[PDB]
Amino acid sequence: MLFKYIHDVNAKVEEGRRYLSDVVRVALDKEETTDPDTQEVTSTSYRVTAYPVVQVGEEEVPYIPVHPKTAEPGQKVTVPTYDVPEKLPVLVRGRNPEATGDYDDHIWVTEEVEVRPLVDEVFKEDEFEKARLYYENVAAQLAEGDDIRHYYRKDLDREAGHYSVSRYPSF
Amino acid sequence: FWGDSKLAPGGQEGLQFDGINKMIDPENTIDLKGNYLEEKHINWGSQLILQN
Amino acid sequence: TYARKAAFVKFLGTTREVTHPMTLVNSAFGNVIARQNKDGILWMLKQIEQAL
Numbered sequence: 348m349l350f351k352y353i354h355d356v357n358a359k360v361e362e363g364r365r366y367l368s369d370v371v372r373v374a375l376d377k378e379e380t381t382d383p384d385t386q387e388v389t390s391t392s393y394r395v396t397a398y399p400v401v402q403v404g405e406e407e408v409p410y411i412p413v414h415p416k417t418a419e420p421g422q423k424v425t426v427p428t429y430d431v432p433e434k435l436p437v438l439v440r441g442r443n444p445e446a447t448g449d450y451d452d453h454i455w456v457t458e459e460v461e462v463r464p465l466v467d468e469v470f471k472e473d474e475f476e477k478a479r480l481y482y483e484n485v486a487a488q489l490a491e492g493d494d495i496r497h498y499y500r501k502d503l504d505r506e507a508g509h510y511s512v513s514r515y516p517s518f
Numbered sequence: 519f520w521g522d523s524k525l526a527p528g529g530q531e532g533l534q535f536d537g538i539n540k541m542i543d544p545e546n547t548i549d550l551k552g553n554y555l556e557e558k559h560i561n562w563g564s565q566l567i568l569q570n
Numbered sequence: 571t572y573a574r575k576a577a578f579v580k581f582l583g584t585t586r587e588v589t590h591p592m593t594l595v596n597s598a599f600g601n602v603i604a605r606q607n608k609d610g611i612l613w614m615l616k617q618i619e620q621a622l
Contacts (some may be wrong), residue, residue: 448543516620 350375350482353429354489363494365465367435368399371489373466375482393478397466397485397495400429434459465495477502582618605609 352373354504360366374397380390407425412418441456466485470478488495505513534546536550546566548559586606599605 447545450543518617518621 348374348376350491354485354486356489357492360494364460365435365463366399366494367437367460367462368401368432370400370402370429371397371465372400372429373397373482373485373489375478391472393470393472393475394469395466395468395478395482395485396464398431398464399435399462401432402427404428404429432462435462466498468500580615582621584610584614 350373354373356366356369356371362379373395375393375395378392378394379388381387382389405425405427407423409425410418410422411489418483436457436459438455438457441454443451443454446452468478468481484497485495488497507513519537522525522540523532523534523536525532527532546556546560548566550559586609588606589604592602
């Protein structure tokens, strides 16, 4: 992971089905396709992703102080580690099959659902700056304090002003 | 007093309507076990109704 | 013979955005908010027409 970013979302965002966790990780990494016969790269690409992660442990990293603070030559700080979970819980209304009356019929039950990436995009080798802009835009959208809303990319859109093709139903 | 609407075969709907003995929740029951009705049982039932 | 039927209401919408500096510059084609509203209304009209 060339770039990595950890953001803490609020209760309104966590309530959604796409943000069932409380921490979001944004990453940018480079992929290489290797020739099966001999080690020789054939194609290269950059990937921008975003997953809801959960804490699994801790580790020690160098301390980087900010303006008011000052650090020792060998000062270190401990930060948590994150991983992508397989499933996350939800709370949905239900009914008790063996309710004896009118007071124990309606209840709440918990279910597990599959976790899917928030963002998954692929960029070519000669488009590093566009990938960097996309990653920065995702980070800014998360910093604004709401859900990720803009996924538009100019390269993958259909032509504009071609009335003979855009007249067909799209809903 | 003694109605019951589930007397059809298989426990289906019958021709009667439920009475006080059946509409009352099964939890709200005091069993005297074949004894007399003392004065404290009135308080027992009163609290059993007050707690709702 | 008689019957009873039900119909379910659905929802349609779209969102338009304009930046703050764009509202301060001079415009050659009138106000821009009205243009955005007109475009949104016409787009919604077409979507409804084909969804029908």
